Amino acid sequence: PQITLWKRPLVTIKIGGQLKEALLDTGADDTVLEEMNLPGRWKPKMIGGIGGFIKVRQYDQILIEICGHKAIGTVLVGPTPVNVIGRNLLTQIGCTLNF
Amino acid sequence: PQITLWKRPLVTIKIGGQLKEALLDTGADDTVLEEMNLPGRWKPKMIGGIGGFIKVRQYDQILIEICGHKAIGTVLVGPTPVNVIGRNLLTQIGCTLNF
């Protein structure tokens, strides 16, 4: 689809078999979701945002469907203010900026 | 143009007679730029993201040129680690997400 930006580009995603809402975030290198339960192994990691750094749980090679488009990649889980889909997954679904 | 997201979507902007690099950021409601001593009246504000909040100065009706596309709107200035062009200005240059 073509998504204008007068509203937040929020989309429904499916991860771990559960539906959620997430923000398409071209300013994020990585995908960071709020606290949740995900199966499998994970490693501690740090990520920095506008306000500093936080601790997150890094889940690698995770299946995630974004607005009907499938991706398999890294998902960070931690105290983010909102679920953000970052460039690591936006590239998988073929997302580009256009103007 | 069409910007792929393999790398950060950085572009040259002109603001307050200065050239700078900034991210086209669909995840930012508004625009936040590095400390710069702009003229005019301003209003203190707090903006938050990953890692917490930072203090910024809100300037209204600021002219910005983004890849030769002129825009005018609110610009927040402060100790942000990165310059982000937010949706308030992206809509003005006709920017969309596409996949």
Ligand SMILES: CCOP(=O)(COc1ccc(C[C@H](NC(=O)O[C@H]2CO[C@H]3OCC[C@H]32)[C@H](O)CN(CC(C)C)S(=O)(=O)c2ccc([C@@H](C)O)cc2)cc1)OCC
């Ligand atoms: C020199 C580099 O220093 P750092 O590395 C951090 O640099 C950064 C910092 C911020 C960003 C942009 C943000 N991306 C981001 O957080 O991405 C995370 C995840 O992926 C990683 O990649 C980049 C960082 C990691 C995001 O797009 C936009 N945000 C909102 C989202 C979170 C809902 S917002 O910025 O918080 C924001 C809040 C309020 C407003 C009002 C005005 O509307 C406007 C913007 C990109 C790189 O270290 C720490 C200093």
